[PDB]
Ligand binder design. Structure first.
Ligand SMILES: Nc1ccn([C@H]2C[C@H](O)[C@@H](COP(=O)(O)OP(=O)(O)OP(=O)(O)O)O2)c(=O)n1
Ligand SMILES: [Mn+2]
Ligand SMILES: [Mn+2]
Ligand code: NA
Ligand code: NA
Length: 327
DNA sequence: CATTAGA
DNA sequence: TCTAATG
């Protein structure tokens, strides 16, 4: 957790690099498994040879480990950190819609900067355009103060469209969090479940509402169950307008909500931990359900849930407020 | 791990 | 269709 800190961090740097710059998935995957075990390793690593004793640690990494233990740095790391081309990819990548792939392509074409991106808006598709347009706004955290204003809007229309809708702004926002990356709203309706062969309008309607009143300003992607967009708080009596925010609305079969909702509420750790517990408690929990575990190894049979309570109940735990869904 | 774009 | 990108 810290006794192995640099080791891990250098390794992660290295790893990341294979994966983005080059396309060395394997090396790339090499580094993480390594980086993952050296972390669990309960003691301070004094040499490569020692690390080496680890699973995943080959001759390759040991070596790096030495140079790093030996001198406060790593050449290859030093070299990569420097290099303009690789530098450039880590950056273009910043744009929503840009990934390694395009980053490499763009680069090899001479697009290294935001400016270049502009001059060639044409080489970019709609998602990336939007990403470019809102670059600045995209990196800015979401003040809960705002988070609450937004939620208030969204719930407001939803209802207005159909009173039957059930919406839940999930995430850290849900989890108390002072700020948040983007708004995730879970959506479900009663006339929509497992079987009940869709109702795409169900997603569309609201999406339509939100736009009608200007909360939604752009669409990264709209399907029949997931909508990825851009929203924004009405710029008041002027002097102050609101940064453009990433928003994801998702449709759900009412018969999956809480799991869903459970799930997204996280925290990643609360999850797994909650998930690990369902196992002893003779179950299984995943994004959509919770099935009783049968001795024969595995088993099935979807337990019926009417709230996040039902689930705790099931696995017989303490109902944890979102607030304390921390770990 | 799964959904939407795209070309 | 594959293949990219975000979650
Ligand atoms: O479980 C998934 O949701 P996000 O990726 O948005 O994660 P959080 O809601 O935990 O983060 P934040 O809202 O701060 O971006
Ligand atoms: Mn989020
Ligand atoms: Mn999200
Ligand atoms: Na080994
Ligand atoms: Na990006």
């Amino acid at each position: 957790e810290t006794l192995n800190g640099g080791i891990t961090d250098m390794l992660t740097e290295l790893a990341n690099f294979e994966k983005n710059v080059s396309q060395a998935i394997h090396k790339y995957n090499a580094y993480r498994k390594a980086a993952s075990v050296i972390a669990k390793y309960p003691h301070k690593i004094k040499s490569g040879a020692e690390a080496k004793k680890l699973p995943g640690v080959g001759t390759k990494i040991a070596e790096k480990i030495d140079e790093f233990l030996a001198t406060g740095k790593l050449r290859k790391l030093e070299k990569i950190r420097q290099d303009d081309t690789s530098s450039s990819i880590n950056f273009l990548t910043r744009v929503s819609g840009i990934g390694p792939s395009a980053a490499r392509k763009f680069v090899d074409e001479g697009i290294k900067t935001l400016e270049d991106l502009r001059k060639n808006e044409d080489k970019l598709n709609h998602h990336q355009r939007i990403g470019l347009k809102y670059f600045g706004d995209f990196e800015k955290r979401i003040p809960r103060e705002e988070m609450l204003q937004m939620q208030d809007i969204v719930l407001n229309e939803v209802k207005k469209v159909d009173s039957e809708y059930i919406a839940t702004v999930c995430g850290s926002f849900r989890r108390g969090a002072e700020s948040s990356g983007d708004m995730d709203v879970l959506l479900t309706h009663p006339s929509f479940t497992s079987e009940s062969t869709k109702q795409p309008k169900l997603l569309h309607q609201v999406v339509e509402q939100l736009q009608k009143v200007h909360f939604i300003t752009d669409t990264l992607s709209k399907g029949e169950t997931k909508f990825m967009g851009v929203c924004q708080l009405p710029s008041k009596n002027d002097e102050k307008e609101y940064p453009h925010r990433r928003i994801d609305i998702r449709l759900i079969p009412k018969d999956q909500y809480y799991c869903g909702v459970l799930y997204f509420t996280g925290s990643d750790i609360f999850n797994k931990n909650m998930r690990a517990h369902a196992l002893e408690k003779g179950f299984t929990i995943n994004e959509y359900t919770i099935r009783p575990l049968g001795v024969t190894g595995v088993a099935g049979e979807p337990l019926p849930v009417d709230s996040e309570k039902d689930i705790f109940d099931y696995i017989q735990w303490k109902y944890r407020e979102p607030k304390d869904r921390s770990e």
